């Protein structure tokens, strides 16, 4: 799946790039410790998930 | 070369190792923000 | 007087010199003076 591999890999990059700016802003804003707890937790699993998905795809195109 | 799969990522791979130096510079942008208190 | 925070002008200015300097180091490898 030569195209479904890049779909996952750009997902990683676009998400990494989000969570790189997003986690530290989230953490030091006083407002929303609770409006954002879920956010980072979901991206987190989403990130890990993506690494795995991209990690297994590799072995069908590498 | 990287595996041809990851070829489109070549220019990002080009810039990545300079990233840790941006961290040092980011700390100074930060203290300028807080006025070197 | 003081409508733009000093730290912003600093970062901007800085990134501006980094570019010009970076360009001069590129020129050492390209074109005139590259030995090529």
């Amino acid at each position: 799946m030569t195209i479904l591999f890049q779909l996952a890999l750009a997902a990683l990059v676009i998400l990494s790039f989000v969570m790189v700016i997003g986690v530290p802003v989230a953490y030091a804003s006083p407002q929303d410790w609770d409006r954002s707890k879920q956010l980072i937790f979901l991206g987190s699993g989403l990130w890990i998930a993506l690494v795995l998905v991209v990690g297994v795809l590799n072995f069908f195109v590498v | 070369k990287l595996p041809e799969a990851y070829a489109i990522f070549d220019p990002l791979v080009d810039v990545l190792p300079v990233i840790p130096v941006l961290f040092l510079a980011l700390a100074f942008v930060w203290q300028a923000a807080v006025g070197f208190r | 007087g003081g409508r733009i925070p000093l730290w912003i002008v600093a970062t901007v200015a800085g990134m501006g010199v980094i570019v010009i300097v970076g360009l001069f180091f590129y020129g050492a490898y390209a074109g005139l003076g590259s030995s090529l």
Partner: peptide, 30 residues
Amino acid sequence: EVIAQLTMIAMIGIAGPMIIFLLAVRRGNL
């Protein structure tokens, strides 16, 4: 080509000053 690299570093490098910018707006805890 080299704009590929320059657009990446353009984007990566401005990533940093931005975090400072956002946390400032938000009267964040700098």
